[PDB]
């Protein structure tokens, strides 16, 4: 063939990666949804023209917010039809009907003009990527835990929040979640 199925494979792997991202962050999705075998993916996504349109490219992502037991607050993200927003990054959807989070995935043809307005709404951010096709055997990353009550640790160690080791905001693992200051 040609470089046709390559883009589909890239996008499918990225989609599975993002589903794993949200499930790890704490937004329940179906396990067989996260599996999404590529044959089923192309069966549901098969363009009459055989194009990345796939005749059903309406990728929608919505959260579950299961761990309200430990997180007193948890918002939502609306990632709809983010299959091919454009050839490059285009400011389109600054804010939607979500009040804590929001994810906009782009083809990494970054537009610094569109990179504005992001640090504007208090409860929002974005760190998306092209494929990001994480966890691997080469990866020695210890699984991360967001300690909602680190007050116990601070009391038992008699510390200040600064004296702990610092992981930067730009850390790719720290971007896997919406980790804050």
């Amino acid at each position: 063939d040609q470089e046709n199925e390559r883009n589909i494979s890239r996008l499918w792997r990225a989609f599975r990666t993002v589903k794993e991202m949200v499930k790890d962050r704490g937004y329940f999705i179906t396990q067989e949804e996260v599996e999404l075998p590529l044959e089923d993916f192309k069966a549901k996504y098969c363009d009459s023209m055989g194009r990345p349109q796939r005749k059903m490219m309406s990728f929608q992502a919505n959260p579950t917010e299961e761990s309200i037991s430990k997180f007193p607050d948890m918002g939502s993200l609306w990632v709809e039809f983010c299959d091919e927003p454009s050839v490059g990054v285009k400011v389109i959807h600054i804010q939607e009907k979500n009040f804590q989070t929001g994810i906009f995935v782009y083809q990494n043809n970054i537009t610094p003009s569109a990179m504005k307005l992001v640090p504007s709404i208090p409860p929002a951010t974005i760190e998306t990527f092209n494929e990001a096709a994480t966890h691997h055997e080469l990866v020695p990353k210890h699984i991360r835990l967001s300690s909602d009550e680190k007050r116990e640790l601070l009391k038992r160690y008699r510390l200040k929040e600064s004296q702990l080791p610092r992981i930067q905001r730009a850390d790719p693992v720290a971007l896997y979640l919406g980790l804050k200051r």
């Binding site: 640090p119 208090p122 600064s162 200051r181």
Partner: peptide
């Protein structure tokens, strides 16, 4: 004194917010 840098990145609908933190720090 603390890391509140990114909180006051947008206050002018600026120095008003920092008045609360200091009293909170001793609180």
């Amino acid at each position: 004194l603390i890391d509140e840098s990114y909180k006051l990145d947008e206050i002018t609908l600026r120095s008003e917010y920092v008045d609360m933190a200091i009293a909170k720090a001793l609180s």
